[PDB]
């Protein structure tokens, strides 16, 4: 899965998340077309609502998101990462609104995640040992796991100044403008 964000000079904005499902999907190219085919059917429940059926779209966590401030587009964001998309995007929004972090600070900040089942508070590297011990004392079951997400985000000043951040978790990515 991958996410990209665009803002133009007129203040129009677009957030796209799109995917083959897994990396390279099936690995099958369709004959002589040069096109790799998705394995999106895995996103159905194999064994009620998200069961496989004809002409149906399998549920996806993909969440291209646009936040509006004082009447204007203000944050454009999104990410790959399956169910973790929800918490990755949520942390972008919370970081920007509640903690007053610039789009790059919000992006490079460490991420945590609780998806109810498994019953664990999943963390990346970067939270204080003092804080994690406190969370354990509160009842949380802390689980240090691999990096989550690849946010590609644009913040927009009321004056049209643009501010962008590519995820450190993805190499060879780029945010650029003119």
């Amino acid at each position: 899965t991958t996410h990209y964000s665009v803002v133009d000079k007129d203040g129009n904005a677009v957030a796209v998340t799109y995917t083959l499902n897994t990396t390279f999907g099936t690995g099958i190219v369709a004959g002589e077309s040069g096109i790799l085919l998705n394995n999106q059917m895995d996103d159905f429940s194999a064994k009620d609502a998200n069961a496989v059926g004809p002409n149906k779209r399998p549920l996806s966590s993909m969440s291209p998101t646009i936040v509006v401030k004082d009447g204007k587009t203000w944050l454009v964001t999104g990410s790959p990462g399956g169910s973790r998309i929800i918490t990755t995007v949520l942390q972008m929004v919370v970081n920007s609104i509640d903690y007053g972090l610039n789009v790059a600070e919000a992006t490079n900040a460490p991420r945590f995640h609780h998806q109810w089942l498994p019953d664990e508070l999943r963390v990346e590297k970067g939270f204080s040992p003092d804080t994690l011990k406190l969370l354990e004392a509160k009842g949380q079951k802390v689980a240090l796991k691999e990096a989550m997400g690849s946010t590609q985000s644009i913040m927009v000043g009321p004056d049209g100044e643009l501010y962008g951040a590519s995820d450190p978790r993805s190499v060879d990515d780029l945010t650029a403008g003119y």
């Binding site: 991958t2 996410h3 990209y4 964000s5 665009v6 803002v7 133009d8 000079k9 401030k69 920007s96 609104i97 509640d98 007053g100 972090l101 610039n102 789009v103 790059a104 600070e105 992006t107 490079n108 690849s150 590609q152 985000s153 644009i154 913040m155 000043g157 049209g160 100044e161 643009l162 501010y163 962008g164 951040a165 590519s166 993805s170 060879d172 990515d173 780029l174 945010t175 650029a176 403008g177 003119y178």
Partner: peptide
């Protein structure tokens, strides 16, 4: 609270532009 768009004193600096911008997983596509 107040928002921060970024200052030179920050550890992490946004990419800056006046007109348009694109953020993506790939430099060439961006």
């Amino acid at each position: 609270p107040p928002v921060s768009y970024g200052v030179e004193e920050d550890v992490f600096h946004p990419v800056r532009a006046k007109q348009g911008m694109v953020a993506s997983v790939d430099a060439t596509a961006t």
